[PDB]
Amino acid sequence: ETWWYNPSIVVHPHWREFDQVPDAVYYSLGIFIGICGIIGCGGNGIVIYLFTKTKSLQTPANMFIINLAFSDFTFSLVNGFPLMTISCFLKKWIFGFAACKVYGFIGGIFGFMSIMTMAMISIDRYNVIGRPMAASKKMSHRRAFIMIIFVWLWSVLWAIGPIFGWGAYTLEGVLCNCSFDYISRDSTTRSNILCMFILGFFGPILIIFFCYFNIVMSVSNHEKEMAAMAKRLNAKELRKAQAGANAEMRLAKISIVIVSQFLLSWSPYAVVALLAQFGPLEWVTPYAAQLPVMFAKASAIHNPMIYSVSHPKFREAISQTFPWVLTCCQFDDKETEDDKDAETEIPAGE
Ligand SMILES: *C/C=C(C)/C=C/C=C(C)\C=C\C1=C(C)CCCC1(C)C
């Protein structure tokens, strides 16, 4: 009688009025997300593997990197193959309501976790680079451990609403994947949406901007300070300190790119959702929602590749364990120099 009917999940009327997209579209969708599964799990596993097992990557702050990779790993796993990919190739979500809820909840829980984790990373950056060299503070296992616990609590908190009625996780677009309900406009649903956007999204963003804008409005605070101590009878040994700042600065840079990646990837979909909840629902067409959600879902497969082309110590480790990966991005000793000087200790004024 209909092409959208699902015996397990009641599809919202809105997605029911559209014609069914072509077969080629479903197949491309499944192939697409399936490849995010491969790259995502593959790439994130490597970072988790390499970071937890390499000695040069054993600093507390790196725990955030691992947590981020775990987040992205699980997102790519659950959101790709087999729940969505298989659903696409059958042009139907054949896994039941319970799976859909788990799917949507897992998508949100780790989506909120990746930015909040980034927030914790932006904080570390502010303590090492954002503050003055005299008060510079490195991350401690204690601190880091507590921070990720906050991350986990926070992430689960703002994504579990729909699990208890304060919102919902159902099918969207072509009905082969799940997410939260941004169509229904009841008090309950709308409050959870507002909470997701404000607490889950805007929240960590503020932390980010407040930390990076704070690192920018301190580049000069540091510019001067570097000199005052430089001519401060600071001998050739000064170079060391300088290398350290370069090394840290590079990582801070990286942090911003992965954050930029996240925003560029999620902001579109976010917007399409808001239109459906506050604007012309007629704009929210099958592709209007689908294509931008795919872009968002792939977000969880980028950091690893970003790291592989800009992270020196990490690039080192790869060359030493899975060198084929660095083919087009060949590694060289010179990439780790700044870390050498920054750590090479001076023997009593040398
Ligand atoms: C494919 C499945 C998806 C995208 C499930 C998403 C769930 C969810 C609660 C998402 C929340 C958001 C982000 C994460 C970042 C961008 C803004 C939100 C609030 C849409």
Please write down the HEC assignment for all residues of the chain: CCCCCCCCCCCCHHHHCCCCCCHHHHHHHHHHHHHHHHHHHHHHHHHHHHHHHCCCCCCCCHHHHHHHHHHHHHHHHHHCCCHHHHHHHCCCCCCHHHHHHHHHHHHHHHHHHHHHHHHHHHHHHHHHHHCCCCCCCCCCHHHHHHHHHHHHHHHHHHHCHHHHCCCCEEECCCCCCEEECCCCCCHHHHHHHHHHHHHHHHHHHHHHHHHHHHHHCCHHHHHHHHHHHHCCCCCCCHHHHHHHHHHHHHHHHHHHHHHHHHHHHHHHHHHHHHHHHHCCCCCCCHHHHHHHHHHHHHHHHCHHHHHHHHCHHHHHHHHHHCHHHHCCCCCCHHHHHHHHHHHCCCCCCC
Nearest residue to 105 (alpha-carbon basis) of 72, 78, 70: 78
Kindly provide the b/e burial profile for residues 260-293, where b requires at least 16 CB atoms within 10 angstroms of the residue's own CB: ebbbebbeebbebbebbbeeeeeebebeebbbbb
Token output for 179 = 């997410």
182: Cβ contacts below 8 Å, ≥ 6 apart = 193, 273, 274, 276, 277
Contact 77, 37 (CB under 8 A): yes
Instruction: Delineate the domains of the chain, giving CATH numbers in brackets.
Output: 2-350 (1.20.1070.10)
Contact 75, 40 (CB under 8 A): yes
- Counting every residue written for the chain, the total comes to 350
The angle that helices 238-278 and 203-216 make with each other, rounded to 10 degrees, is 150
Burial of residue 22 (number of CB atoms within 10 Å: 0-12, 13-18, 19+): exposed
Ligand 1 atom nearest to 266, measured from its CA:
16
* Interatomic CA distance for residues 60 and 340, integer angstroms: 19
Ligand 1 atom nearest to 273, measured from its CA:
20
Phi, psi for 82 (deg, rounded to 5) = -105, -10
Contact 284, 13 (CB under 8 A): no
The distance of Cα 214 from the centroid of its chain, to the nearest Å, equals 21
Give the Cβ contact number of residue 305 at 10 Å: 14
Phi, psi for 11 (deg, rounded to 5) = -65, 140
Does ligand 1 lie within 6 Å of residue 292's CB atom? no
Q: Radius of gyration (Cα) for the chain, nearest Å?
A: 23
* Interatomic CA distance for residues 86 and 89, integer angstroms: 5
Token output for 247 = 């090394």
Experimental method: X-ray
Phi, psi for 261 (deg, rounded to 5) = -60, -45
Beta strand 169-171 pairing with 178-180:
antiparallel
Does ligand 1 lie within 6 Å of residue 170's CB atom? no
Burial of residue 128 (number of CB atoms within 10 Å: 0-12, 13-18, 19+): buried
Does ligand 1 lie within 6 Å of residue 262's CB atom? no
Does ligand 1 lie within 6 Å of residue 108's CB atom? yes
How far does residue 193's CA lie from ligand 1's centre (Å)?
A: 10
**Amino acid letter for position 16:** R
Ligand 1 atom nearest to 169, measured from its CA:
7
* Interatomic CA distance for residues 289 and 273, integer angstroms: 8
Place of tokens 């999204």: 201
Q: Is the peptide bond before 82 cis (omega within 30 degrees of 0)?
A: yes
Does ligand 1 lie within 6 Å of residue 290's CB atom? no
Token output for 138 = 């490195």
Burial of residue 131 (number of CB atoms within 10 Å: 0-12, 13-18, 19+): middle
Dihedral of CA 86/88/90/92: which sign? positive
* Interatomic CA distance for residues 124 and 60, integer angstroms: 10
